[PDB]
Write a protein that binds this ligand. Structure first.
Ligand SMILES: CCCCCCCCO[C@@H]1O[C@H](CO)[C@@H](O)[C@H](O)[C@H]1O
Ligand SMILES: CCCCCCCCO[C@@H]1O[C@H](CO)[C@@H](O)[C@H](O)[C@H]1O
Ligand SMILES: CCCCCCCCO[C@@H]1O[C@H](CO)[C@@H](O)[C@H](O)[C@H]1O
Ligand SMILES: CCCCCCCCO[C@@H]1O[C@H](CO)[C@@H](O)[C@H](O)[C@H]1O
Ligand SMILES: CCCCCCCCO[C@@H]1O[C@H](CO)[C@@H](O)[C@H](O)[C@H]1O
Length: 257
């Protein structure tokens, strides 16, 4: 199976066409943020009654569009990642959604076997990424990136680097690279069935950035208990230039590996 190998997983054909493939993690946690960005969402009619406690979730799927496109162990794929912040408890304002980040990708991935002194480069993926919050001005955030995702493992460790280059219109947030940087590092450690993870981005030039620490353990064969702690800038597109520390607990399907 090869833990956390996204590309190798996509090559494994499913009998039922409706059985999709996981790309990033899939979870639904009840959170509590340190500070809520009302300044950015001031245009909303419920902005003032915004609660610091929100239901946060992430949906992430991969769709193999063409296997073996560039030889065996290669694939032309697509993926969809959605992160949503929901003011569920806020019954006073009809439980509105504060932000949703739609993140579809089109890539060319390869399942590899390169040795790096104990480590093994399992995935090499290169593609285009679109990320917008589907909002109308002034609360509209959006940016496009061309990237490369590398994944390597070493026993109970997993490391994934994802450098990128911004392409296209950045008018909705001209300085988004100031807070996001030029790459994303992800680390995962397997302590038996417990999975510890780290995911962050950092601009070494400006000093801005954010990080995410997570810990899961299986409830059953498919679901897991997940605890997350984000801290820094760029949690969501609307909060790309807003700093906050968020803690949440909930359920998770798949983790890093
Ligand atoms: C399940 C609810 O769905 C949510 O509804 C929101 C409000 O329309 C949308 O902004 C989100 O994209 C959607 O995930
Ligand atoms: C995956 C299918 O989705 C599409 O992926 C594109 C990737 O380039 C995005 O630019 C589009 O906005 C998105 O609709
Ligand atoms: C490494 C393989 C990458 C496959 C992703 C296909 C991206 C096609 O997508 C196109 O990419 C262009 C890049 O300059 C953009 O200018 C276009 O707006 C976008 O539609
Ligand atoms: C395979 C390992 C790839 C690591 C990706 C790191 C790339 C991030 O590197 C960044 O590049 C920018 C443009 O040159 C510089 O301005 C930044 O100072 C630098 O941090
Ligand atoms: C961060 C995890 O660190 C690991 O923890 C293991 C369990 O204690 C040790 O056996 C390993 O040497 C250590 O790298």
């Amino acid at each position: 199976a090869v833990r956390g190998s996204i590309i190798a997983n996509m090559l494994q054909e499913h009998d039922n066409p409706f059985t999709l493939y996981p790309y990033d993690t899939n979870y639904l946690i009840y959170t509590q943020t340190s500070d809520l960005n009302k300044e950015a969402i001031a245009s909303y009619d419920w902005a003032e009654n915004a609660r610091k406690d929100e239901v946060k979730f992430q949906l992430s799927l991969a769709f193999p569009l063409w296997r073996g496109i560039l030889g065996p162990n290669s694939v032309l794929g697509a993926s969809y990642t959605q992160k949503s912040w929901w003011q569920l408890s806020n019954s006073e304002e009809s439980s509105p959604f504060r932000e949703t980040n739609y993140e579809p990708q089109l890539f060319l991935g390869f399942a590899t076997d390169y040795r790096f002194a104990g480590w093994t480069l399992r995935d090499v993926e290169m593609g285009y990424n679109h990320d917008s919050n589907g909002r109308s001005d002034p609360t509209s955030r959006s940016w496009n990136r061309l990237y490369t995702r590398l994944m390597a493992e070493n026993g109970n460790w997993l490391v994934e680097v994802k450098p990128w280059y911004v392409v296209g219109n950045t008018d909705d947030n001209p300085d988004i690279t100031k807070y996001m940087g030029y790459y994303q590092l992800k680390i995962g450690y397997h302590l038996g069935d417990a999975v510890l993870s780290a995911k962050g981005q950092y601009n070494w030039n400006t000093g801005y950035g954010g990080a995410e620490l997570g810990l899961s353990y299986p409830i059953t064969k498919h679901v897991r208990l997940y605890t997350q702690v984000y801290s820094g800038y760029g949690e969501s597109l609307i909060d790309y230039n807003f700093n906050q520390t968020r803690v949440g607990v909930g359920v998770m399907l798949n983790d890093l590996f």
